[PDB]
Amino acid sequence: TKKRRNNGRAKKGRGHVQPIRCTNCACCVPKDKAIKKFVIRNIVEAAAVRDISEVSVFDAYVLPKLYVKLHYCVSCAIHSKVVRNRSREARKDRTPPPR
């Protein structure tokens, strides 16, 4: 019997897909049967920025962001708590944690 209806994210109306790799575990996994995670983060983060904003002169520019589209495989994504175990009732929801 099926423990996941969509099997970790579906591939219906599509006959095959290419595999994506993990960005920290490098292992082959389907692209839409695996976790996909957008990462928008400041270039100077919450760390550097405090002295970088005070020391800056002749500048007026809002901070850059780094954009990277991470892909995680299932085993790594559970492990480091990108996703984590939930109730079987809760599984039927496609609604995820807000960002």
């Binding site: 957008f38 270039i43 007026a60 520019y61 809002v62 850059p64 962001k65 780094l66 954009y67």
Partner: protein, 215 residues
């Protein structure tokens, strides 16, 4: 183990931008001395300076970068010419966003001057003013014709006019704007920018123009 003490032998040069900008003294850089025992004319006139266009112009942007290439050195002043404009990385990635249609067009075009340029473009279909779809999509046919308009305008306006005037147009994106208008009949569009320019062939026979641009 093996070191030298080399910051006692270097000479200072004032990197000069064109007089087509309000800031012409970009700053200074020290290069190794050009002499017959230690050779540095290579490392001096091969230089490509990556400068932010905001610092070069006196401002309008705070993204965007111009690549400036030393086309000759005259008396510790180094006279640069257009080599490319990109949008850095940050700006470019922030335009690319989910639940939209990313339209890409690229063209190879010969200028009035000697220079071959490859000019990449980007455009986005907008979420319009009463739309209740989250996503913005259209038929493939539409997007294809939008690309032809994009390519045609971009080639036509770079084929005509000298390299400097092409530059001067592409900074306020008047080429961009014309694309937006000609496409507005179909899908209105939001954005439209030249995202990369790659100088493919750069010949010099234009020391005339080089001096004309500076001063």
């Amino acid at each position: 183990k093996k070191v030298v003490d080399p910051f006692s032998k270097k000479d200072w040069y004032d990197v000069k931008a064109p007089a087509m900008f309000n800031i012409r003294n970009i700053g200074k850089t020290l290069v190794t001395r050009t002499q017959g025992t230690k050779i540095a004319s290579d490392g001096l006139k091969g230089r490509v300076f990556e400068v932010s266009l905001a610092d070069l112009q006196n401002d309008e942007v705070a993204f965007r970068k111009f690549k400036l290439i030393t086309e000759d050195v005259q008396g510790k002043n180094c006279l640069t010419n257009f080599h490319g404009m990109d949008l850095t990385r940050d700006k470019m990635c922030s335009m690319v966003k989910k639940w939209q249609t990313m339209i890409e067009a690229h063209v190879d075009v010969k200028t009035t001057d000697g220079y071959l340029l490859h000019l990449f473009c980007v455009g986005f279909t907008k979420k319009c003013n009463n739309q209740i779809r989250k996503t913005s999509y259209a038929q493939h046919q539409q997007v294809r014709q939008i690309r032809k308009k994009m390519m045609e305008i971009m080639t036509r306006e770079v084929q005509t006019n000298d390299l400097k005037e092409v530059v001067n147009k592409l900074i306020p994106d008047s080429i961009g704007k014309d694309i937006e208008k000609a496409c507005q009949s179909i899908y209105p569009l939001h954005d439209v920018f030249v995202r990369k320019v790659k100088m493919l062939k750069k010949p010099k026979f234009e020391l005339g123009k080089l001096m004309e641009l500076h001063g």
